[model samples]
Target: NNIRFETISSKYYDDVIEHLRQTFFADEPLNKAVNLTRPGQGHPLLEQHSLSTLKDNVSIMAISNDGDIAGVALNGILYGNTDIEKSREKLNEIQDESFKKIFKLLYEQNLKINLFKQFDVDKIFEIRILSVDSRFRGKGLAKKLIEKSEELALDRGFQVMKTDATGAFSQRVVSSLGFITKCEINYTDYLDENGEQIFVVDPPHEKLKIMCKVIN
Candidate 1:
């Protein structure tokens, strides 16, 4: 029949991390543009940070009929009672120089936009990462995983569904599913100390957009 979808469990943390390391963070548009997965490079902090989402229970997984993890949506809560500062501190401690620089830049920009302040939502459900195995691509698994996150957000009393659509593909997905863009920062505009663009993904993936959908 069809793949089964559900909230992530502690037992599948390893499977989820492996899948994300190989498919999501390693191959995603932004990371690819920045050469985050270059030859001889070790695992970046993104994977570790993504795994931390498991402790919050907002992530989701798509299971194949044979029990393989076909896809995953790593999600987390923001504002309200959540302590995002702890996660931020941990992210700041990542040892990868490139990762640290880029993470800090994005984190600062996100704060500047402040979706919680703009939306008046005390709590939001944010999709941190979305990935589907290459073999399982084209099956609309990502869309289904996102829909499941929306359901979970509703169940958890979140007022908004949000994501930092860092790639053209994810931007398309979120836009197609009715997410509205709040603000965006183009790569060219996010320059470094030497005035060089940090990321140069293919055209149209030129910017990072903060997108959201009101749950009510």
Candidate 2:
């Protein structure tokens, strides 16, 4: 069944964020590695982060005819260091030991490339988080959500689209959709200053990728 798509607004912010907290952040590769979500106790910082992405009003979601939310795409636009410095400040505020690593990795990977200058654009759209309801699995809802997100972004003049694909699954989706790996690093190879591996995730997910696609 083809799912209907809608751009995220205040009306659907809570619903979208709640869906992400339960599925995406809770079960994602990096979060799983760090055990960031304590079962039913969702990660406040992660949820808050999801909230921030939705505020951009560029996200999208898929809903079935019965009103069930099939999937969500939390996207945002970046304006160079303004966004990067914002991340830096937030990273210093995360007190949870394991959660701190997740944020640290986020900031670290972010610094690796200046997507704005790299692409010579003012706004680069980002696919921050995407998740499909269990009932909607194998329907390609996630891909549909992304496709709709790209349409919204392009209409708003975003010059590029980026996804921090940390899992093999996410990377595969973006890759199949023609997103290129601008930069990638193996999880086990990411280490501390003293040579300790910073993150340890489950198998079949060995790398973190900064994947991007230029807009038409």
Candidate 3:
């Protein structure tokens, strides 16, 4: 099914959550070591735990022509500090149902509190979330999401755009968009059975890269 993209308002929130829960964020996928924070384990956004905390930010959703939500993308005027190893550790701390609850809360809180006040929206654009259903994989829906994001960012006068991909395909997507890799880091704290602190400075198997561009 060909998918359509639109600016998600509050009305589409339920569909977005349902799509995420069943598709990319299912329990198995959520718990998958390869997935972000274990897929569905990360956040219970539909529960409305703390959305009010976000005040007003932007969220976009992708829906099929049938009106079934297929994917979601969240963006804003600024970006968060996804570079710190400590932040990643804190994210990994939640598990089971608690993980989803904490994730929803964090998403709301981050949207509200983590913005770069001094930064102009026209100067920088960050895409915080771009999740699609597993069934919809390889469909180019994510690319559409980003294309929409750039349209919005450029309309606002953003000169540069950046994002952090959790996997190699994501890394390639950003590269395809004409973003330059500014930095990469990988901490080996994940390899041990005990989740012990290890000092291996290997590249991120799920590494994050920063990209920038001069808007036309």
Candidate 4:
């Protein structure tokens, strides 16, 4: 199988978004547990975030021999002086109860905000989303995308490369590539009003880990 990696451009932006909407994100374990998408509606926060990164032209995509998207990596920068509250204010528009609860839990965790404060860097390239088509899975597209992202991040003078790995597979990819674990939040620790775990993913997807690699 032949695969070509390319930096995302405006022409292919919509294709990548549609690919993610239908494939990688649609059935992601955490989204399924939270019921983030509906029959006709989708995850508003994800759509908004992906669009923002696309507009910035900081994403990468893999093209299969047939020209369809085999995989994609969406990324963005979190500046040192970023206002976390202001950044997440748009999440208020999310109406789904489950989406609201999940976002609230992630926000309170303050993972990214604290990372910026703790590091001496002014900017970090954060991998916001990585999705591979089912057909392309196990073919190394995801790893290829992240490896390309690392090159791009360094080219753009980013001091650090980071990923908030929400699933075990994603976590394994980063860790295998030598991205150190900066912090972790277990699903069982995130509970609801009744003290029941809010996110109950099956085996292997137990925690959300913030992993990072300093680019020298």
Q: Which stretches of candidate 2 lie over 4 Å from their true place?
A: 81-84
Top model by TM-score, which number? 2
Instruction: In model 2, state the lDDT of residue 129.
Output: 84
**How much does each candidate deviate from the true structure in C-alpha RMSD?**
2.5, 1.7, 7.1, 2.1
Candidate 4, 1-216: lDDT as tens digits = 799988899899778878877886657667878777743345667787688888766788999889999999898887887775773784686667777776776666655446656678878888888889888888988888999999988888877888878888888888888899877889888887888989887776888887898876
lDDT of 3: 0.54
Off by over 4 Å in 1: 38-44, 80-94
Query: Candidates' TM-scores?
Result: 0.88, 0.93, 0.62, 0.91
Candidate 4: segments with Cα more than 4 A from true spot = 38-41, 91-93, 111-113
| Candidate 2 local lDDT, residue 4 | 86
Clashes of each: 0, 0, 8, 0
Clash number for candidate 4? 0
Tens digits of per-residue lDDT for model 1, 33-148: 76777432436466567777877899999999998899999998776666768659956677766677667766776776766777787778889888888789999988888888
Alpha-carbon deviation at 87 in model 4, angstroms: 4.1
Better of 1 and 4 by TM-score: 4
Candidate ordering by TM-score (highest first)? 2, 4, 1, 3
Give the C-alpha lDDT of model 1: 0.80
lDDT of 4 at 1: 71
Model 4 TM-score, all chains together: 0.91
